[PDB]
């Protein structure tokens, strides 16, 4: 648990509850959704599975409480979009969850003083198409060969993603052309504005503002959430009033070396001759045929057999080794 | 620009090479071998150490017979002695006069010292060469560490360095070696499970922490003394302890070509055998055109002092007439004379002092300063010492 | 793994690139950027905005599982398993074929080798992937080329420092779009896994069978093998004491 | 228990060295029995060892390849002849 | 290595090759490298007299 050096922190959250922005210990950084299955990699401000004395305890949580870090409960932690989400892994700043269709992501917990804090971030969640096959075997019993696959263990281990504050989420709908002036409609949110025109051309507003004698194209506005965490995405801009401040969360489905079961092609009709071997190949699917001499000059030859084929191969004194698909190599020697 | 050069496999001697790219001003590079390491691929056969003859309390059967049980232990020895009647500090210990027996059992184990005091029996296969080379590139010393196979490329200051392949495949180690602490011996040790008593390999184990051991010590139990409780035995002394006294000098002292033997891992260091090719791909940014480099005219060479020795025992003053301020390369066009200076600064109507090393008494040599050559006349004298402490 | 963080979009100002010591670190600042988002814009100024696009190359999470090892083969040690029908019973003898390693089975000393041929199917440079060994002349450490085998070089699958030559260049983002477009040569390892061909197991002469963990040449029909057997005197019976045969027909 | 440690050994005093035509002369003054060993730095090393106890004068031939002389626990002295 | 006019003389000549060394960690001492007494060595390696 390399947390001796690392500590939980207090960051800006745009929605701490009832649309009010505050400094939340459960602040959202980065919300990664690269997984085609639907798994979300959430980066938070606090640390899960570690205690204040720097020790591993899965039932405990470590959050920042007014200058000093304090302990909380793992059972108190919750993730929700429109309905509650099933947590499939927790380690440090990272949370793995499967969520239903929603427009805003909410991550919360309960402290020692029995007070609940939750950070809400606007996140369009709708699992889209994500697959690279038909997912279907395959024989139940066959030749054992080494391969690799992504396991279904939700447990917070191995792999991890970077999460940060949404940053200041840009929104062009906040600004409106009121005749010859620009009106910034807040709608109970903290908005950071900047304009090319004179007078007031910077600031962090909580109230409705109007910029006299200006155009909408000459202005820029963004909602400041600092309560929730979001995935460090290259398709989303970086938080203006932030350098390289980021969190990290453990991700489900890691890569592991397994065993793949492959079928063995049917034995061909073999007929022997004077220093030659004849094979009548009947493949059901594209089967690879390879052959080599068991002497000084091997002379390797490979071909993909697909149709009904008759092959005549010369057998030298040293011997001829023929491999037909996943079957064990057939060895041939001529009679004296 | 790729520059290929061949230098002898001699550590501590600086060698200078002239890099002449057509159309560009010459460049002088100083190369020195800091270390030449030959590490052989080892395979541990077994380890030998001091043995422990584990002997428990003898089973003295009063008024009866004891029987030997065949035990699966290294060098297990058992014997029952009839008609025993010994005593002790207090007195006797049996009732019967001649109807008593004594069971004397023994076995050989690895001593507690085997984890600390042990000799390893290795089988050397092939060796991988690697060298540490110092290069005076652009008036700065750079360190290059790479394998001497002629394939492993290392880039230092945007210049690709290729070291090797080695001229000689020679190694001071044989196909069978023995390692004790910091000493390596070329020994034809007995194979695993074929050790003889009193010799190196009387006790054979796979690792210093291994469970099963091989033991051939020639252990035989003897009949105890009259009225005495003890286990007397005849056994050949420790082969490892005997070898530690009668091993002689290690490879570090006996190996040819002045080889230095190092341990953990075992390797041959600074073996003066053959030559070593070095390929240097100098970037085009390091080069300056002949036209853009300062030209030299009106050159004269005066030698006020010269002593022909292994070191730079000669001093030379070269007068010149330069076109502009810039750096010019200094190199001897004679294979008998070597210059200490790689590059100097020129301006106009001035002079330069250079240190040179030669073996000849009458030395007529050409010095190439920048792109123009000058003839130097020198009458060097013999040195006071006949034997020197550094190679040249 | 091309690690690309969130791009620093500086509204009404200029961002500056910081030279970082990271494998294949690439940085670029694009002037006159004015993109939007699902909600709308994100900047106030029309042409006075900048975007900092930073990137670097790291070892993928798969490197612990999916990896190819570049070995340098020196010398080889031979060992053989021999079956002997000694005194009407089959005995198993496993020893090194050097002609020095002696093994005693049923009070009989067995010496196997030395091998007639010092030939090996492996070269001085080999490449191992799972259960397949390839005789490859791989590029040296710190001299790998982009798109080829060795574009990313690391000491061990768990190593900290890595070598990277992938030819990574940042591109200018699309009109009113927040993204980090880049031009980079595809994975040399992924390309090699497709264009490697048959391993030594299928191409080696003398009918060699290639095994892994540790890598070895098994059952190579090359040359001969001398075997020395020191049979004890107890196994022998005198001619006089042995039954004599007369009147024989075949 | 037995444990591997570091033993501190003294280095013998430097002998009076005088050079000659392809030969080296050493005036050895040992306080205690000191081991003297020498080898050639070429193809044929020809290792020779002797335990010096009394005042001794040793004449050793130096070949073109070089001669390495080890006097007790001191670092090996290397000698090469002048061209 | 040490030359004086008389056994009671004031001024002396000395060539012993004396060099000071750096002291050990947390130790107060004056370590030095010096060639041993030439007179003491001669008294052992002089041989037979006239």
């Amino acid at each position: 648990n390399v947390y001796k050096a690392t500590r939980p922190y207090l960051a800006h959250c745009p929605d701490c509850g009832e649309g009010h922005s505050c400094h939340s210990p459960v602040a959202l950084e980065r919300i990664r959704n690269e997984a085609t299955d639907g798994t979300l990699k959430i980066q938070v401000s606090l640390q899960i599975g570690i205690k204040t004395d720097d020790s591993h305890d899965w039932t405990k949580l470590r959050y920042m409480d007014n200058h000093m870090p304090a302990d909380a409960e793992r059972a108190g932690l919750f993730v929700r979009t429109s309905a509650p989400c099933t947590i499939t892994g927790t380690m440090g700043h990272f949370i793995l969850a499967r969520c239903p269709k929603g427009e805003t992501l909410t991550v919360g917990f309960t402290d020692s003083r029995k007070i609940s804090h939750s950070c809400t971030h606007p996140f369009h969640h709708d699992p889209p198409v994500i697959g690279r096959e038909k997912f279907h075997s395959r024989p139940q019993h066959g030749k054992e060969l080494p391969c690799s696959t992504y396991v279904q263990s939700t447990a917070a281990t191995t792999e991890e993603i970077e999460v940060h504050m949404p940053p200041d989420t840009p929104d062009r709908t906040l600004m409106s052309q009121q005749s010859g002036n620009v009106k910034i409609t807040v709608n109970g949110q903290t908005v950071r504005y900047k304009c090319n025109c004179g007078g007031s051309n910077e600031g962090l507003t909580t109230t409705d503002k109007v910029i006299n004698n200006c155009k909408v194209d000459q202005c820029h506005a963004a909602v400041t959430n600092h309560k929730k965490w979001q995935y460090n995405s290259p398709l989303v801009p970086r938080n203006a009033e932030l350098g390289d401040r980021k969190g990290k969360i453990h991700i489900p489905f890691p890569l592991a070396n397994v065993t793949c079961r492959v079928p063995k092609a049917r034995n061909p009709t073999v007929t022997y001759g004077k220093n030659q071997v004849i094979m009548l190949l009947y493949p059901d699917h594209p089967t690879l045929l390879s052959y080599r001499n068991m002497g000084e000059e091997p002379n390797y030859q490979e071909e993909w057999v697909m149709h009904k084929k008759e092959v005549v191969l010369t057998v030298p004194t040293e011997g001829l080794e023929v491999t037909w698909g996943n079957n064990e190599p057939y060895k041939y020697w001529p009679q004296l | 620009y790729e520059h290929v050069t061949v230098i002898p496999n001699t550590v501590g001697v600086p060698y200078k090479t002239l890099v002449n790219r057509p159309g560009y001003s010459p460049m002088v590079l100083e190369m020195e071998l800091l270390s030449v390491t030959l590490e052989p691929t080892l395979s541990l056969d077994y380890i030998t150490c001091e043995y422990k003859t584990v002997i428990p309390s003898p089973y003295v059967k009063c008024c009866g017979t004891a029987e030997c049980k065949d035990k699966n232990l290294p060098d297990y020895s058992c014997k029952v002695f009839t008609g025993v009647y010994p005593f002790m500090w207090g007195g006797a210990y049996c009732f019967c006069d001649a109807e008593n027996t004594q069971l004397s059992e023994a076995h050989v184990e690895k001593s507690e010292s085997c984890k600390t005091e042990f000799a390893s029996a290795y089988r050397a296969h092939t060796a991988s060469a690697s060298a540490k080379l110092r290069v005076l590139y652009q008036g700065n010393n750079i360190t290059v560490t790479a394998y001497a196979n002629g394939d492993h490329a290392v880039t230092v200051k945007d210049a690709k360095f290729i070291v090797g392949p080695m001229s000689s495949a020679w190694t001071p180690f044989d196909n069978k070696i023995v390692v004790y602490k910091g000493d390596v011996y070329n020994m034809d040790y007995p194979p695993f499970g074929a050790g003889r008593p009193g010799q190196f390999g009387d006790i054979q184990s796979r690792t210093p922490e291994s469970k099963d051991v091989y033991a051939n010590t020639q252990l035989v139990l003897q009949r105890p003394a009259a009225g005495t409780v003890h286990v007397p035995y005849s056994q050949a002394p420790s082969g490892f302890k005997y070898w530690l006294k009668e091993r002689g000098a290690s490879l570090q002292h006996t190996a040819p070509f002045g080889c230095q033997i190092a341990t953990n891992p075992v390797r041959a260091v600074n073996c003066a055998v053959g030559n070593m090719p070095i390929s240097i791909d100098i970037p085009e940014a390091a080069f300056t055109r002949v036209v853009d480099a300062p030209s030299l005219t009106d050159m004269s060479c005066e030698v006020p002092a010269c002593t022909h020795s292994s070191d730079f025992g000669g001093v030379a003053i070269i007068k010149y007439a330069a076109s502009k301020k810039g750096k010019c390369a200094v190199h001897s066009m004679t294979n008998a004379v070597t210059i200490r200076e790689a590059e100097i600064e020129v301006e106009g109507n001035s002079q330069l002092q250079i240190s040179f090393s030669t073996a000849l008494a009458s030395a007529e040599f050409r010095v190439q300063v920048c792109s123009t050559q000058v003839h130097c006349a020198a009458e060097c004298h013999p040195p006071k010492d006949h034997i020197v402490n550094y190679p040249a």
Side-chain angles (χ1 to χ4, degrees), chain A residues 146-148 158-159 164 168-173 194-197 214 216-222 232-240 244 255-257 290 292 294-296 298 300 321 331:
Chain A
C147 69
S148 59
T158 325
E159 306 172 336
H164 74 113
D168 307 341
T169 321
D171 190 46
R172 286 270 175 193
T173 57
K194 196 189 178 75
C195 292
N196 278 297
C197 309
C214 214
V216 139
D217 300 284
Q218 281 163 256
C219 294
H220 178 264
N232 196 357
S233 175
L235 308 159
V236 170
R238 205 187 292 182
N239 197 296
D244 262 287
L255 194 93
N257 17 43
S290 70
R292 59 153 178 188
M294 289 182 276
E296 198 184 82
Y300 178 81
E321 196 198 70
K331 286 168 185 176

Side-chain angles (χ1 to χ4, degrees), chain B residues 24-178:
Chain B
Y24 295 89
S25 187
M27 197 193 281
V28 180
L29 284 158
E30 189 189 63
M31 301 169 299
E32 193 180 70
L33 278 161
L34 301 159
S35 77
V36 179
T37 310
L38 285 150
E39 199 189 294
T41 311
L42 309 162
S43 296
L44 182 77
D45 281 17
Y46 62 89
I47 62 99
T48 195
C49 53
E50 204 170 314
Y51 65 80
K52 194 200 178 289
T53 306
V54 181
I55 72 289
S57 292
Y59 181 66
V60 188
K61 223 279 166 188
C62 303
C63 303
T65 318
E67 58 189 290
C68 273
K69 191 189 175 182
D70 182 47
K71 291 179 183 182
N72 189 64
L73 282 152
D75 248 327
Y76 180 76
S77 307
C78 195
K79 236 187 267 183
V80 184
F81 304 99
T82 53
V84 287
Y85 186 92
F87 301 55
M88 254 201 103
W89 167 77
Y93 181 83
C94 279
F95 181 82
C96 296
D97 293 84
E99 296 85 30
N100 320 297
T101 55
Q102 197 201 104
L103 181 112
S104 298
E105 59 177 292
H107 82 279
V108 174
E109 266 191 54
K110 253 202 296 186
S111 184
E112 296 88 11
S113 62
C114 296
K115 307 153 196 174
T116 306
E117 287 287 308
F118 66 99
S120 303
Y122 288 111
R123 195 163 280 175
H125 307 275
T126 185
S128 60
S130 62
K132 194 185 175 184
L133 189 83
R134 179 188 65 90
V135 171
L136 186 80
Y137 175 76
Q138 296 180 307
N140 273 303
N141 282 322
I142 58 155
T143 315
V144 174
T145 312
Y147 295 103
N149 54 31
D151 189 77
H152 178 227
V154 170
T155 307
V156 185
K157 255 98 179 181
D158 212 64
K160 196 178 84 175
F161 285 89
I162 291 164
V163 167
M166 292 273 275
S167 179
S168 191
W170 179 86
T171 54
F173 317 102
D174 292 336
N175 296 79
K176 281 164 85 75
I177 63 140
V178 161

Side-chain angles (χ1 to χ4, degrees), chain A residues 56-67:
Chain A
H56 291 282
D57 198 289
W58 87 276
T59 49
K60 293 281 162 285
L61 193 131
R62 193 169 73 177
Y63 83 102
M64 192 73 160
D65 182 77
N66 309 305
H67 211 281

Side-chain angles (χ1 to χ4, degrees), chain A residues 132-192:
Chain A
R132 326 176 328 113
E133 218 241 279
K134 268 62 193 189
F135 40 95
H136 276 135
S137 325
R138 66 155 295 271
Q140 209 197 118
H141 300 99
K143 193 202 181 179
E144 284 193 295
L145 279 177
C147 69
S148 59
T149 203
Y150 298 101
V151 286
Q152 280 179 264
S153 59
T154 315
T157 29
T158 325
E159 306 172 336
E160 57 208 70
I161 62 158
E162 289 182 321
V163 289
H164 74 113
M165 283 178 185
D168 307 341
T169 321
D171 190 46
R172 286 270 175 193
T173 57
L174 293 160
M175 296 161 281
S176 58
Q177 264 275 78
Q178 200 184 99
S179 304
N181 308 322
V182 178
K183 192 221 174 76
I184 304 144
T185 324
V186 134
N187 285 168
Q189 291 172 295
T190 322
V191 174
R192 200 183 283 266

